[PDB]
Design a protein around this nucleic acid. Structure first.
Ligand SMILES: [Mg+2]
Ligand SMILES: [Mg+2]
Ligand SMILES: [Mg+2]
Ligand SMILES: [Mg+2]
Ligand SMILES: [Mg+2]
Ligand SMILES: [Mg+2]
Ligand SMILES: [Mg+2]
Ligand SMILES: [Mg+2]
Ligand SMILES: [Mg+2]
Ligand SMILES: [Mg+2]
Ligand SMILES: [Mg+2]
Ligand SMILES: [Mg+2]
Ligand SMILES: [Mg+2]
Ligand SMILES: [Mg+2]
Ligand SMILES: [Mg+2]
Ligand SMILES: [Mg+2]
Ligand SMILES: [Mg+2]
Ligand SMILES: [Mg+2]
Ligand SMILES: [Mg+2]
Ligand SMILES: [Mg+2]
Ligand SMILES: [Mg+2]
Ligand SMILES: [Mg+2]
Ligand SMILES: [Mg+2]
Ligand SMILES: [Mg+2]
Ligand SMILES: [Mg+2]
Ligand SMILES: [Mg+2]
Lengths: 187, 147, 52, 104, 128
RNA sequence: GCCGUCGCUGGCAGUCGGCAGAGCGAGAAAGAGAGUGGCGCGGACGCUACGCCGCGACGAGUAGGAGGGCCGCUGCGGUGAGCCUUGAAGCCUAGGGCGCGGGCCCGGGUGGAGCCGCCGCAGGUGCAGAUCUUGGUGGUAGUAGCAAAUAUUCAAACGAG
RNA sequence: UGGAAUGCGAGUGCCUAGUGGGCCACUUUUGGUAAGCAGAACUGGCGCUGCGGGAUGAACCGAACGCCGGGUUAAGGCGCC
């Protein structure tokens, strides 16, 4: 007998996409090869994000892509997101962008192209940037989901700003006892 | 579908996933929200603060149409008109400002979140926030109150 | 019994609700019946406007 | 009937399954709970930091010039050692050629 | 004089007896089909010495000789002549078994064609 | 030695062939680099990439969780130019086998009219128990027993008795 | 000169079942004449666990378990069984 624990032997991590999409799996075949046969860590990161689930691939808005592609030294670099590029109506002017994405919404496509930009697919990124050179890999906000408002210390604990689960919002819905000192206590 | 669910995997396993000791009994703890001020108090206090008690005034015969007031922030203001409306106004030299009628778009109050483009505009609305009025005035616009 | 975090729910199923379940399997049949009566009414009152 | 009352038996075994972890440490600790009067001034100190921005630029550039100026003005066995040298893929590259030339 | 396979390695079986179910010798209502004993006190489940044995992945067969017939081939059920021709290019590793519900008339053709293609048939002499 | 699990988030798209040139496992970064001046017609296998291959460690399990089932049952959409009176289902079998197993294949017999594989869909889908339901059958067992109220016998007849 | 040794990849988040009768031993220890009694601390067990030894045995001693061949052992043994 060997003195060892086995509860952590199996690592919980995706080796492939749960999706049965045949176009996504053709891109995984592509980047499985590039990640294996090139020393480029960029390929490994993209291969990993192709396995990732829907909530681990948040959409990247147009306004946020412009901000991150406007930092100094990022001129003529292709912005890359393994996800969806959504349009942002709060933007007034779109610059000339070169972007690679899994999906670009219909209105984001017109605005990027109308500014003189180029929209790639990941099979076109490989031919243009086999090792990922001259790229800017970008991610959407992962905690930008309604669930993360409900996580943390339970709402009924001191200095807990977690959001409760209420069927309705209003004066009659979880506001008397425990939420104001006038009714029992507050914390 | 039933073929993908636990029951098919729990065939032959005596207790069916509920244990040999505690068993699956009918209603231990009570039905529904029983015990909220009692044997279930920690769960309610921990996760539903405010649940018990009363706060604030009653209102009989509430009519939610009377308080109808959709709001729009300034950062979405120019989406209510066409794209050519903004560019034509931006490039024109006479200085004419376009009229944006938020009530026609279905909004009543205008709110101040956001920054406007450097472009005069005339905004019609039932209500304005203080900061919305100043931001509209900072670009050379004018606020118009409708009823 | 409540279990960890969740919503407090009050389903209104404390009466004999199964004695008063209204299904909608006759919905296509109603749509055909109402349509067949609009047409038969339009023919009857023609050339007066079918809408009314 | 009567039952057992209390025990901590088996409890340290449970606590150590996922380890008794020490509290997490971050380089910046929150200012919660510090003296309100002290904190009020620390916010006033931070608020007006930009007043002396130009002086810092002047002093920093002055210091850099002086710092650069001074710097610019300022600036086992013989057999086993020989063999370890020859076996070195780079250093012994020419020593190895001499043996090969000698051998032929 | 029968067709021979490309190789005939020794077939090693870890176990040749069947795993008979617990207490299935004592009752007729208990069939010998294996059922994993799950009673609390069950001494077979606890692997007491001298008791009925339990199947576990350790008894698994060598992958190289798994599903291999004693002749060295591997069977493949066929229902007609057309299904038989899939074994044209693997006639040295896979033999043909004709399904039970193929009439005596059709067995003659499947057996006749298999001989032409050098495919071995496990049950060629049936329904004559 | 073999089986599986886990790890290396390991290797393989280079099957780059006569429009040829076979290598990149080796102690120690980065090119089997490119140029400018001083006869035969030949060469195994592979790669369902959800595939295939290598190396190392590991393997107890109630309650309980999860995965994988080319495990099994009934029906529905597709498909198998599927099977079948030259014999379906079902059933039986000291016949031959396969799989760790759930199970399955084939042979022989009986049977007499329908049935199955594969990709998907669906579920009233898997029994040893519940003093479980209904039906059937045992040992007990040719056993307990055919004992309350006094009682029968002779001859003949019919009749197979 | 990543400022003791040694070993080891870590951090983090959601959802979550069963459990919430325990019992035993070395040592410490309360009540009790004591109890295979009742009640605590520490660690380890049995419970959930087979296997060699203690003839037999939940807990003792050795040792923890995929299916095998060879070798060698532990605790225990070597008149015969
Ligand atoms: Mg082991
Ligand atoms: Mg384990
Ligand atoms: Mg685990
Ligand atoms: Mg279990
Ligand atoms: Mg359960
Ligand atoms: Mg039970
Ligand atoms: Mg319970
Ligand atoms: Mg209990
Ligand atoms: Mg229940
Ligand atoms: Mg519960
Ligand atoms: Mg207790
Ligand atoms: Mg037990
Ligand atoms: Mg195990
Ligand atoms: Mg028999
Ligand atoms: Mg008939
Ligand atoms: Mg049904
Ligand atoms: Mg049954
Ligand atoms: Mg039964
Ligand atoms: Mg008698
Ligand atoms: Mg005690
Ligand atoms: Mg128990
Ligand atoms: Mg344990
Ligand atoms: Mg043990
Ligand atoms: Mg003894
Ligand atoms: Mg041995
Ligand atoms: Mg002895």
């Amino acid at each position: 007998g060997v003195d060892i624990r086995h509860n952590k032997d199996r690592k919980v991590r995706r080796k492939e996409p749960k999706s049965q999409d045949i176009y996504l799996r053709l891109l995984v075949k592509l980047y499985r090869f590039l990640a294996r046969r090139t020393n480029s860590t960029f390929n490994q990161v993209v291969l990993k994000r192709l396995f990732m689930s829907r909530t681990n691939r948040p959409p990247l808005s147009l306004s946020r892509m412009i901000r991150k592609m406007k930092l100094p030294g990022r001129e003529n670099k292709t912005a890359v997101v393994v996800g969806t590029v959504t349009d942002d109506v709060r933007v007034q002017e779109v610059p000339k962008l070169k972007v690679c994405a899994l999906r670009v919404t219909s209105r984001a496509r017109s605005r990027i192209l109308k500014a003189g930009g180029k929209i790639l697919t990941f099979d076109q990124l490989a031919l243009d940037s086999p090792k990922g050179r001259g790229t800017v890999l970008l991610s959407g906000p992962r905690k930008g989901r309604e669930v993360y408002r409900h996580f943390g210390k339970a709402p009924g604990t001191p200095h807990s700003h977690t959001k409760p689960y209420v069927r309705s919002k209003g004066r009659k819905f979880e506001r008397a006892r425990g939420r104001r000192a006038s009714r029992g206590y507050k914390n | 579908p039933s073929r993908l669910r636990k029951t098919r995997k729990l065939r032959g396993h005596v207790s069916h996933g509920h244990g040999r000791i505690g068993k699956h009994r009918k209603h231990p703890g009570g039905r529904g929200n029983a015990g909220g001020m009692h044997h279930h108090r920690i769960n309610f206090d921990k996760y539903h603060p405010g649940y018990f008690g009363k706060v604030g005034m009653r209102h009989y015969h509430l009519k939610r149409n009377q308080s109808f007031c959709p709001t729009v922030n300034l950062d979405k203001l120019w989406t209510l008109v066409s794209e050519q409306t903004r560019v034509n106004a931006a490039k024109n030299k006479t200085g004419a400002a376009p009229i944006i009628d938020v009530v026609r778009s279905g909004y009543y109050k205008v709110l101040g979140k956001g920054k406007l483009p450097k472009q005069p505009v005339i905004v019609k609305a039932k209500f304005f926030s203080r900061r919305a009025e100043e931001k509209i005035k900072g670009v050379g616009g004018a606020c118009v109150l409708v009823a | 019994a409540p279990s960890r975090n969740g919503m407090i729910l009050k389903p209104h199923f404390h009466k004999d609700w199964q004695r008063r379940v209204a299904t909608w399997f006759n919905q296509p049949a109603r749509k055909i019946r109402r349509r067949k009566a609009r047409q038969a009414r339009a023919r009857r009152i023609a050339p007066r406007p079918a809408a009314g | 009937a009567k039952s057992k009352n209390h025990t901590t038996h088996n409890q340290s075994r449970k606590w150590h399954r996922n380890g008794i972890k020490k509290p997490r440490s971050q380089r910046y600790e929150s200012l919660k709970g510090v003296d309100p009067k002290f904190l009020r001034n620390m916010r006033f100190a931070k608020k007006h930091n930009k007043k002396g921005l130009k002086k810092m630029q002047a002093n920093n550039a002055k210091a850099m010039a002086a710092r650069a100026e001074a710097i610019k003005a300022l600036v086992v066995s013989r057999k086993l050692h020989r063999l370890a040298y020859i076996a070195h893929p780079k250093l012994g590259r020419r020593a190895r050629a001499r043996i090969a030339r000698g051998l032929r | 004089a029968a067709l021979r396979p490309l190789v005939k390695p020794k077939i090693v079986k870890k176990r040749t007896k069947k795993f008979i179910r617990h207490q299935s010798d004592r009752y007729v209502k208990i069939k010998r089909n294996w059922r994993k004993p799950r009673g609390i006190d069950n001494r077979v489940r606890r692997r007491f010495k001298g008791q009925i044995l339990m199947p576990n992945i350790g008894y698994g067969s060598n992958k190289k000789t798994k599903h291999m017939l004693p002749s060295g081939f591997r069977k493949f059920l066929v229902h007609n002549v057309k299904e038989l021709e899939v074994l044209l290019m693997c006639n040295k590793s896979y033999c043909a078994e004709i399904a039970h519900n193929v009439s005596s008339k059709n067995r003659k053709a499947i057996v006749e064609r298999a001989a032409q293609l050098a495919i071995r048939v496990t049950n060629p002499n049936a329904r004559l």
